Design a protein around this ligand. Sequence first.
Ligand SMILES: C[C@@H](O)[C@H](N)C(=O)O
Length: 340
Amino acid sequence: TIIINVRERIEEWKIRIAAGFIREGKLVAFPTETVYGLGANALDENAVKRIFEAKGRPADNPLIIHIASFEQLEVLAKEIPEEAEMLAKRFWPGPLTLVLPKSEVVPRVITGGLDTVAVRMPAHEIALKLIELSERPIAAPSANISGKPSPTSAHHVAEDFYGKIECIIDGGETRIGVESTVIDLTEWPPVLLRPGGLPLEEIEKVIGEIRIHPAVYGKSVDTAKAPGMKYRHYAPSAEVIVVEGPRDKVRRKIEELIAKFKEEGKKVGVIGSGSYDADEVFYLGDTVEEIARNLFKALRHMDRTGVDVILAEGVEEKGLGLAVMNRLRKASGYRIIKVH
Ligand SMILES: C[C@@H](O)[C@H](N)C(=O)O
């Protein structure tokens, strides 16, 4: 593995090293505005397949293709809806992923064997410069072991993958903290498949109101058009209990369980903004924007220690809040103590 520190400023030749790797059919981890992605050349079955391997990822769970130019979209998808052009021209480059019907050049191995392809234009200097220089599209899911928390720093990528992959570009920590929003434009009205860095409300202002796939709220799915729907994800080794309801009643409830779970002789931490006494306590932030930014730091911080159980305070499902609650809820496999 080669780690390229590009935190301070970007230096062309550094990124060129990695571009070579991408071309050589090797794996390269890169920063994005959302999470680090584990990238391969998208036009190379072999390269791509290396990704599912490294991750332990079912060939079933599709990948997202990252582009840097609007013209490469027409290359990867056919019969592009009008809405897609409107969302792309308003929100790309940005934390938005569009599901479209697949052009023929895109390998079935990327899409998990569907005529539907997921595409994004990452809003990050490096992610874009990498794509340009490597003169190829990059298929790139979250750069973690399948099932575990998402990476939001090179440290996180490295503790999962140092040794086992050729390259990690270190860009510092990712600005937003959670994955891109996936919108399905292969149906009318469109469907939100994964809540993300781009709030629903913003998208609904542009194109019409959209529907929400029940996957978002924990319906198991036989077949997945996008990542983060089928299989477990975002989950530490530990157990996670998410508690939601009004401020005090949630805090109160958290306190009962700390003590309850301490009596059973279990080590316990909490994620939230409420100030309890336990082995571990990670403060997520005052604002949702801040919470989204720290969510995986926290989940990984807890996992590295030896807490056997984690208690997460819920948050409002508006804005980035829809994503955090989605992630937490899917981390615990839907253990949600609802308080009234
Ligand atoms: C790697 C990053 O782009 C991730 N796949 C996302 O959609 O947010």
